[PDB]
Design a protein around this ligand. Structure first.
Ligand SMILES: NC(=[NH2+])NCCC[C@H](N)C(=O)O
Ligand SMILES: NC(=[NH2+])NCCC[C@H](N)C(=O)O
Ligand SMILES: NC(=[NH2+])NCCC[C@H](N)C(=O)O
Ligand SMILES: NC(=[NH2+])NCCC[C@H](N)C(=O)O
Ligand SMILES: NC(=[NH2+])NCCC[C@H](N)C(=O)O
Ligand SMILES: NC(=[NH2+])NCCC[C@H](N)C(=O)O
Lengths: 82, 79, 82, 79, 79, 79
């Protein structure tokens, strides 16, 4: 088991990931119930500047990026962990 | 029936619905965003990319303004 | 359909109620997923003084009362709605 | 003066603001998103369609990119 | 001075405090429970076992009824 | 396996556990209370009356101090 932020995110996503999609400036990341804030916290700890911000509900996370291009780059980075 | 459950819940919980771009902002009574979000998530609506719920406001994300209008219109039909 | 706070609570509980139990000074009220705050809000709007306060998670509400006797009285009042 | 409460709260909890398209992302101190969101919703500005708050991040949805800038600059005025 | 931040926040958001047994129930303005909870957790007082915050209500769990009173009175000092 | 899932999740998310009276206060990493709460709710533990989760703290309610100790000891066994 690896402990850096990315590895913690990767690990957490193994159990928690449900879906990821994007539209325009935002990524919609769906998690297992009650896991949105947990995953949001790990994401916020990655410190990816391309991520303008994250807003987490209970099982859904919205990641806002400045541009569609930034959104894709962040989505791709997350996808890599899956 | 998910749709019927949502309609029932919206009677008391609904406050406002609007949209811009590819999203719908649905305002509920205080504390109701998650409850309504749970019902909307149970809808079998492919066009609904997801919902993110605060306390009294739900953001419904669709891919496109056209999908957004479709989804909003379907919610409006329940009021 | 009736619209007073109690009737709104009663109505909301028809769909949302899962379990109610108590221990000492507190009631544990379990709801359908994502319904704790919704039910907490209705409960807080009843203005029952015997209720010291409510703290809601996602599907679980803790109602704190000053005494076990108060707790029972509030639990009984809720039970009546079910 | 009506903004004094929001100004006060921002002075203690504001971290950063940015916007993109129809949205403003406002970061607060941990656990302050709902608190600032309530103050923002209380403003009842028609340029703000709504807010969704997480724990430390608020998304404000405005009706247009122009409204978004207008709202963002109004908030920045308070800092 | 280390409590100044919590005092400030309470001055704007505190509604009421009560306690029973091992617990303190602190009511805040809507959406302020997590915000005050964060300030309280930052205190890292060993008399407070922890806090759980809803939207406008914080439950502080202390180790004993005596600790509960001690903590409640410390908080009341700030008002 | 619910227990195994919880154990796996606790590796990263666990911070502190304590108890008083008939409750357990379980502190997790920021933002993890609900995630861990979901796992604990999936345990088939009759003694656990329920959990209420904040942001990083979970309150686990049991009926009695004896049940509380039992439940805490079972959680401690996972660390
Ligand atoms: N258990 C629940 N709260 N379910 C509803 C989730 C609603 C929405 N997807 C959100 O994450 O904010
Ligand atoms: N009682 C409250 N938390 N009010 C603030 C709500 C802020 C925002 N509309 C949301 O639903 O996330
Ligand atoms: N979808 C979830 N968040 N599930 C976990 C709920 C945890 C706990 N029963 C609470 O209501 O706070
Ligand atoms: N302590 C936490 N919950 N941290 C994660 C916050 C995630 C995201 N920025 C939000 O506010 O929803
Ligand atoms: N706007 C709301 N969520 N209101 C209900 C609050 C319920 C309860 N007092 C809590 O803080 O958890
Ligand atoms: N980032 C935060 N919301 N921090 C405050 C947490 C307050 C309290 N321990 C809870 O979990 O509800």
């Amino acid at each position: 088991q690896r402990f850096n932020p990315l590895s913690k995110l990767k690990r957490a996503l193994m159990d928690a990931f449900v879906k990821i999609d994007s539209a325009s400036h935002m990524i919609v990341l769906k998690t297992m119930p009650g896991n949105a804030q947990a995953i949001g916290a790990l994401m916020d700890n990655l410190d990816w500047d391309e991520m303008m911000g994250t807003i987490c509900g209970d099982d859904t996370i919205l990641i806002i990026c400045r541009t569609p291009e930034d959104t894709e780059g962040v989505k791709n980075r997350l996808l890599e962990l899956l």
